[PDB]
Amino acid sequence: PAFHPGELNVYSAPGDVADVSRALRLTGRRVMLVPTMGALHEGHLALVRAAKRVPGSVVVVSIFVNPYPRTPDDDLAQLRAEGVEIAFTPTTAAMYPDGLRTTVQPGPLAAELEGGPRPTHFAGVLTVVLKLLQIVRPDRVFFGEKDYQQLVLIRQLVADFNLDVAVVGVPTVREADGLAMSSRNRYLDPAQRAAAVALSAALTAAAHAATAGAQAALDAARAVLDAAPGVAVDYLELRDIGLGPMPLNGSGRLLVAARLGTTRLLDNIAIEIGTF
Amino acid sequence: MAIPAFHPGELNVYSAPGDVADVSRALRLTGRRVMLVPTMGALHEGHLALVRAAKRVPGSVVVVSIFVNPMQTPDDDLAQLRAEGVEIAFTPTTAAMYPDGLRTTVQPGPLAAELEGGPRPTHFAGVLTVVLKLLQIVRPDRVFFGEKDYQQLVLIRQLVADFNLDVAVVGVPTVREADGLAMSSRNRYLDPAQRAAAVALSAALTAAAHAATAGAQAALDAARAVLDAAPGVAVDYLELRDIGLGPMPLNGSGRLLVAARLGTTRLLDNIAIEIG
Ligand SMILES: COc1ccc2c(c1)cc(C(=O)NS(=O)(=O)c1ccc(C(F)(F)F)cc1)n2CC(=O)O
Ligand SMILES: COc1ccc2c(c1)cc(C(=O)NS(=O)(=O)c1ccc(C(F)(F)F)cc1)n2CC(=O)O
Ligand SMILES: COc1ccc2c(c1)cc(C(=O)NS(=O)(=O)c1ccc(C(F)(F)F)cc1)n2CC(=O)O
């Protein structure tokens, strides 16, 4: 396959990107992977920028939706402007020629929180991520921290399968009021958008409240969520940073998921208890 | 950062996954092609054939792993490897392989529920997980298995296809005793009557293969007849399938697989079949 350095090369076939990726690595370049479902926003640009600041790196951004917002004219233009040299955009047929066959079965974390009502959801995420990792074989792969449980499951996948890639979590880029960036924010009417600030407001309230201990942190977050119109909370949980089965100590992660109309929003934050 | 000690032309034993990973990387960067022979130790002639097939690749360095998977002849095994010119034995502990215990695993496609998956329903999940791990630690160019456990071999090829692994899977024809009995650690348990009756499995299969000019029913009936002539041979299945273990086509290449119990020992064998 042709590679044009300092231009955006778009590859469809896993074979093409795999050969280009390996050739590059051989000539000393480090391969950075940013896996996406497209519909790119500023948080993705932050993943790319962090990937680009890795010296001698070549950046690969993949755009692929398993089997939703699909806007690839926008997606590609942004990459060219950030100076990304590789977009990997495979077909479903190329990723899944045999359909669903060999799969990743996540540990029990995958049955908690987001996984509780969606029992195969993380199996599907870990299977596609493993496949992207094997196609591309990057040195480092980048994720936003907003989908924190998913990021922890990925660290599990990488440890548990001895995968030779460094996983980089990048702090969640926010709108000016604190709203975690998300593709799905577009689905909020003006009143829902106004109210949605409560998730991030609740979590920062909790993070400062936590000097007074874990119950006070939780109750602060809960009062903010309850003060907000049309916000229905699925969960609000405080956990170890690995998300269990450890009891929380002095440091943890506070996670929330809520529905505004039909739109589910997630957010999370670091929390120190007895602030520390 | 510093590569662990490796001495070309002799036997280098590592028990730490990170060490073998580092040696193997260092080796392929200097030209060598890395060949992986996974074993559970207690080496026999079947393993020495996997080994000889590996050594014959120009520029090969040979990694034999020795690992008994609880989820699935010592200084002696190592002596055998030395006498074969094997340069790397990988001998990890259970703790090294599973430092976080059992967590993320491989879930096999539906083939794992058939045939051997009938008696042992999660056996292949355990095999595919350890094989994925060994492949990721060693990162070989080629990996060598006997054709004796044929279903296991097909499932591994599904693993490799499905997860986009960049390794070649090499199946090496089954090594057999003088009378045709497929080498197996279990053979030494058979008393003389069982041992004499056991020849029926390979006898049935070769008869079928030669009968196949007369078609599929003729092949199967010949095999059955031969099995029916043996006392104490309790056949769990005798099945003709295509080379991928889906259903046998009209006419073309196939595989005939058999499994049976003699006293307390379970024996398997299989053979290439050509219809017509
Ligand atoms: C650095 O700041 C941010 C903030 C939010 C982010 C991101 C970065 C990245 C995402 C995100 O979800 N991207 S995405 O859905 O295309 C995505 C989804 C799933 C996976 C995974 F793990 F399966 F490969 C990767 C990217 N998201 C959240 C989102 O768009 O909902
Ligand atoms: C906890 O309650 C449930 C309900 C349904 C479940 C399960 C659990 C588990 C499965 C399941 O494992 N399905 S299956 O084909 O293994 C599977 C595995 C992986 C994927 C994925 F997401 F990778 F694509 C889909 C289905 N399934 C789907 C099934 O058994 O067909
Ligand atoms: C070239 O011909 C042969 C003939 C028989 C063989 C072999 C090769 C290899 C074996 C064998 O099982 N080796 S082993 O159990 O130590 C083994 C077990 C499991 C795996 C796997 F796939 F999990 F990686 C590999 C080797 N066996 C059968 C046995 O020893 O029971």
Numbering used by the authors:
A (entry chain A): 4 to 70, 82 to 290
B (entry chain B): 1 to 72, 85 to 288
Describing publication, verbatim:
Herein, we describe the use of GE to optimize a fragment‐derived inhibitor of Mycobacterium tuberculosis pantothenate synthetase, an attractive target for developing new drugs against tuberculosis. Pantothenate synthetase catalyzes the ATP‐dependent formation of an amide bond between pantoate and β‐alanine. The work presented here demonstrates the use of GE analysis to critically and thoroughly examine the binding distribution of a lead compound and illustrates the practicality of applying GE analysis to modify parts of a molecule that are not making efficient contributions to binding. In this case, it led to the generation of a relatively potent and bactericidal inhibitor of M. tuberculosis pantothenate synthetase.
Based on these observations, the initial optimization strategy was focused on replacement of the methyl pyridine and the benzofuran groups rather than the acyl sulfonamide linker in both compounds 5 and 8. Compounds were designed with the objective of optimizing interactions at the P1 or P2 sites of panthothenate synthetase. Consequently, 1‐ethyl‐3‐(3‐dimethylaminopropyl)‐carbodiimide (EDCI)‐mediated coupling reactions were employed to generate a series of indole acyl sulfonamide compounds (10–19; the syntheses are described in the Supporting Information). In order to establish this, the structures of the four most potent inhibitors (10–13) bound to the enzyme were solved using protein X‐ray crystallography. The X‐ray crystal structures of 10–13 bound to pantothenate synthetase show binding at the active site, with a conserved binding mode for the indole sulfonamide fragment core. Less obviously, the substituted groups on all four compounds were seen to bind in the P1 pocket of the enzyme. The P1 pocket binds the alkyl groups of the pantoate substrate and is primarily lipophilic, surrounded by the hydrophobic residues Pro 38, Met 40, Val 143, Leu 146 and Phe 157. In contrast, the P2 site binds the phosphates of ATP and is relatively hydrophilic. As can be seen in Figure 2, the binding orientations of the added groups are all similar, and no new hydrogen bonds are formed. In addition to binding assays and X‐ray crystallography studies, an inhibition study was carried out that demonstrated that compound 11 inhibits pantothenate synthetase with an IC50 value of 5.7 μm.
